[PDB]
Design a protein around this ligand. Structure first.
Ligand SMILES: C=C(NCc1c(COP(=O)(O)O)cnc(C)c1O)C(=O)O
Ligand SMILES: C=C(NCc1c(COP(=O)(O)O)cnc(C)c1O)C(=O)O
Lengths: 399, 257, 399, 248
């Protein structure tokens, strides 16, 4: 609780970051979800149910692997990969989904809806709903259905309805808008399983609480394998769930640097990026007061990235607060930098990462050069790259 | 003292009718045509005009309004064009409130936007994604610049939240029938108005996707105002004469003796 | 041990299952590999290296999951899934590959070759070779390259060369033939990383020794979760590696039924199957004396299955021995049965299995109906279904 | 007392030459044509004929032989057709051995195949996928039905395994593969006086002559199949050229 927001969902004071910038039509169900979560987060039977699924279904704990063959590309620093790529469904998304799906059942909801960009949250949600016998509808931007088609097919096999969103940029922000519209209309029976650490209270806190396990495990593992706390912990930042998940356990370790890496696309100078902290500014978007990419009038600027999971012009409010506090540094990584790292990891360690995660790996390599020989850097390897194989093969001229 | 929109509702209630509240988005189909359209609403008997601020990600707008706001943004519409629209409405003898999502207001500056809206003759602000829980700055700016604050209530609203939302509102409370976009063609609306009347004497405007004289008349039996949006946009797309005719039919609907 | 073959590779004495039916041209390298294995299997450095990789890289142990929503489809029996699907690369193949790849490096070999049908062994081999910096060439039948195309692209991204084999049936047996010819020509520098529990000595024993970890984990896990040894342990059977891996630790528990399920394709009566034990007979094929599908003159009959991994007319010699002894029963499962189970596992447990593994699940459902309420059945869930999503979506009309 | 092929190699060694050993697969392009081709080899001066048994998965066969055996199998060739081929060769005055992968022999019955091979006038068996380590049944059948047993050695063969393979062979040793062939023949000569045949993808007269300088036999197969595919006259011409090659 030291790092938690107030009862209104605000970080850093009464007007700060987060809150609930939603219509009154959603407030009954938002208050219903908030009350249900406050009740269940302190119920041992709930935590036991979540733990049992984490262990036996999802295969936790995920291991921590020292990628020694990266060292020479990282200034002889020691890169440790936190292997969320090995989870059921292939990403960290399943952690949050199991929690929220269990909560949906506890609340008596019969229908679950979700947004997805990379399709990993969509697949995770479909997975949990199949497991728990819930009806499932996934909203996905039309551009994303085409570039993450493996995940569309998986969702469909799992019994989910997939709705391709054609509005706006046809990517994650637009999928979120449609899912929101569904929830407004169907609040009585429908639970909205939100997939990142953004949105109105209680979502930033709840999503973060279910992703905390990553950091809790990593903090124990790194002390065991390296003999000490790391010099840095790093992750990629879409809306912010995998990053906040791994960071949280190290917040009160003052010697541990925390670095989030955001998608810079073609470059921050080009206007084709998703570098929210580098190029954005404070505003109200998708339920929260946080940073977003916006023009002089406050219109959302459409994001671009080769990574569908980082192609989002906003970011979660806890990250905005941590940025303002000076606790986390957030830095841009381009498409090219990320793909170089994607390729390097395949070639050197035999791990095919998600293109999202390759941004974190790319950032870690640069940080390694900065910190130098023997520095211990823990990297959240948020997911695997099966969905991205076609894109990557094309990038590297392998068909 | 009294709300800015108080005299309009008192005047309507004295003539045994509801207020006709007409929505158009600034910049559709372009900025000059939209201003001409809003002027036409004043001339055709709209008691209050909701000047819509086009937003890039309008979660509560229906398809008709969403396509129109997209088109306005492609045309290059700006937030200050909405302030110009309010001026033109005020000059024509009309009464304007602005409907906007919150971020354009934050970006402009809450105090500054309230100041400039009031300077243009604007009477208040309708805030579909701002709940009273987050409205501290807006409440202060609203009191300082003498602007009405129209929050929304929904059928799902709990007793506590409904009471708190009505208490926080000045001018009127917008009750709507849930899903995004103007209503198009159920006892939810009279029930919701009924719940607002049980805790307060503030006027209640009702939005239900109204498209015809008959629907406006049904709503005027129980509501103090009839809110129309989607159908006005559809009318304007066909032409300015079609808008004048529709507005005239709705103006007849709100009157009932 | 009690279950090992003699120094010539023969199981069961004088019947002679196994052995070495190879040309003299291969015997120098076969004897080289045999000697290197015997040396390294008792070297603590080697076992430490293998262990470190299994834990931190591959993510072992895999969990054991009670699939309670399957129970009503299995006579109210209790189906426990041994989750090899959650391993790095998505199957059991990685277990054997890390062992053999480490061994290749110990021997000073500079080039690794492998056959693949489903593409999982190919991907695992490529993975290990990336990790250890070995040149890699994978042989894959042309029909398999088409129906497991996701794995071809993964192999290529991992830096492996892939050679499409167009001879014979253009499936696993033909890939094996080509890899064999490569080894014959390039024995001095090349290690053959054989992916199943068949072939000449030492491969059946060595592959099984590296896969034994599955059963050893399962035996401990089931006693922990269920409070006793299972009533049965089951697996699908291609060449036999995942089956022998999970079975081995239960061989000396006399109350534990062991059932292998082989691919029956369109049905055993149709001549379009891979049901080696059901329809085959003893013979020498691919280096061993074991069972194979063969005609009256001893010509290999081409196998057929919807599953690329089980589409092999042979089977490993240790299985032939266990069948002869009456320790394991081997039963046919058709394409249709397997796909029904595929779909069921998706809908009930949110797990997308490999079509290979779906055969084992289908068999488990039938065995559950035989054994009845409360019977404890451990099923080896050998792989995940990423590679099969297109096939399955097409099967279920989901496009 | 002595091997079945011993008198052939002694007769060659007395005429200061190597034996020409010719391989054709039974049933290519069909069964009657293949027998007519094998007869042509006897007439064109092949000292020994290797009658190939087409196998469905021939691991050691190169592309030319593999495609021919595939074609023979499509045509419906049977193991008995090989025994008929051996008989036709023997009646024509030729000397035949059978080359086969092991499973067809197992299926037939090892003893029964030996018995029937011997009754057809067959002199022995070449076994590319049978090492002595697995050859217990074959050794017994070989001794009983008086058949030569030609095992293969390779450049990679260890000293111990080379010795064991040569010791287990009767008739000749098939040395299969730059300077590798003469070196391998040299290593067999150092432990035994058994004849050594060399197979090296021989295509021409000059190549057969080079091999005849050190080897007791020159084995040709791929080139004979290629010749037969063009025509039966082309096979005669090539076989006659190779016959001249071994006499230098
Ligand atoms: C947006 C989606 N994924 C984001 C994602 C991210 C970025 O999202 P975070 O919420 O910042 O963790 C990182 N890694 C992987 C493997 C991802 O799939 C999605 O799948 O719906
Ligand atoms: C033949 C190959 N796979 C076989 C396979 C099998 C059958 O192979 P076994 O050797 O019987 O375990 C089972 N499960 C999965 C997931 C598989 O991929 C291959 O990928 O090369």
């Amino acid at each position: 609780t030291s790092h938690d927001p107030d009862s209104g969902g605000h970080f850093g004071g009464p007007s700060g970051w987060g809150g609930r910038y939603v219509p009154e039509a959603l407030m009954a169900v938002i208050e219903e979800v908030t009350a249900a979560y406050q009740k269940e987060r302190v119920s041992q039977d709930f935590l036991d149910d979540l733990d049992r699924l984490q262990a036996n279904y999802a295969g936790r704990p995920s291991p921590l692997y020292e990628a020694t063959r990266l060292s020479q590309h990282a200034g002889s620093a020691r890169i440790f990969l936190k292997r969320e790529d090995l989870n059921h469904t292939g990403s960290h998304k399943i952690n949050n989904v199991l929690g929220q799906a269990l909560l949906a059942r506890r609340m008596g909801k019969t229908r679950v809806i979700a947004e997805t960009g990379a399709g990993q949250h969509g697949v995770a949600t479909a997975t949990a709903c199949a497991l728990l016998g819930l009806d499932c509808v996934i909203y996905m931007g039309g551009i994303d259905t085409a570039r993450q088609a493996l995940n569309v097919a998986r969702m469909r096999l799992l019994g989910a309805e997939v709705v391709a969103v054609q509005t706006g940029s046809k990517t994650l922000k637009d999928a979120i808008n449609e899912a929101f519209r569904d929830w407004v209309a169907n609040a009585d029976n429908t639970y909205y399983c939100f997939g990142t650490a953004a949105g109105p209270h209680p979502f930033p806190t709840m999503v973060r609480d279910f992703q905390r396990i990553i950091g809790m495990e990593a903090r124990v593992q790194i002390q065991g394998q390296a003999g000490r706390l790391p010099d840095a912990v790093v992750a990629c930042v879409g809306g912010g769930s995998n990053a906040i998940g791994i960071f949280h356990a190290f917040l009160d370790d003052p010697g541990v640097r925390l670095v989030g890496f955001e998608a810079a696309g073609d470059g921050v100078e080009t206007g084709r990026h998703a570098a929210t902290f580098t190029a954005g500014s404070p505003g109200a978007f998708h339920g929260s007061f946080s940073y977003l990419l916006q023009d002089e009038d406050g219109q959302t600027i459409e994001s671009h990235s080769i990574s569908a999971g980082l192609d989002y012009p906003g970011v979660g409010p806890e990250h905005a607060w941590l940025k303002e506090a000076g606790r986390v540094d957030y830095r841009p990584i381009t498409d090219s930098e990320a793909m170089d790292a994607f390729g390097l990891l395949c070639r050197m360690e035999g791990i095919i990462p998600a293109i999202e995660s390759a941004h974190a790996v790319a950032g870690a390599l640069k940080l390694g050069v900065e910190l130098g020989r023997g520095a211990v850097i823990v990297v959240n390897l948020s997911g695997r790259g099966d969905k991205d194989v076609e894109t990557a093969a094309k990038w590297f001229g392998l068909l | 003292e009294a709300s800015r929109l108080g005299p309009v509702f008192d005047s309507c209630r004295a003539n045994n009718r509801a207020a006709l509240i007409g929505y158009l988005p600034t910049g559709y189909p372009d900025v000059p045509a939209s201003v001409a359209a809003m002027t036409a609403l004043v001339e055709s008997g709209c008691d209050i005009i909701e000047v819509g601020v086009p937003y890039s990600d309008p979660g509560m707008d229906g398809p008709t309004i969403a396509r129109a706001t997209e088109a306005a943004l492609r045309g290059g519409v700006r937030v200050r064009d909405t302030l110009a629209a309010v001026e033109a409405i005020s000059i024509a003898g009309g009464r304007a409130v602005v409907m906007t999502y919150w971020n354009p207001v934050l970006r402009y500056g809450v105090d500054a936007f309230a100041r400039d809206l009031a300077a243009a003759g604007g009477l208040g602000l309708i805030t579909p994604d701002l709940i009273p829980d987050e409205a501290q700055q807006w409440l202060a700016a609203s009191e300082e610049h003498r602007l009405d604050r129209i929050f929304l209530v929904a059928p799902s609203s709990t007793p506590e939240r409904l009471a708190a939302t009505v208490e926080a509102s000045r001018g009127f409370v917008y009750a709507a029938s849930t899903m995004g976009v103007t209503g198009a063609r159920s006892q939810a609306a009279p029930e919701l108005v009924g719940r607002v009347k049980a805790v307060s004497d503030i006027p209640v405007g009702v939005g239900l996707g109204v498209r015809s004289r008959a629907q406006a008349a049904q709503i005027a039996q129980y509501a103090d105002g009839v809110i129309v949006g989607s159908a006005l946009v559809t009318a304007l797309t066909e032409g300015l004469p079609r808008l004048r005719a529709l507005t005239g039919e709705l103006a007849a609907g709100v009157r009932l003796g």
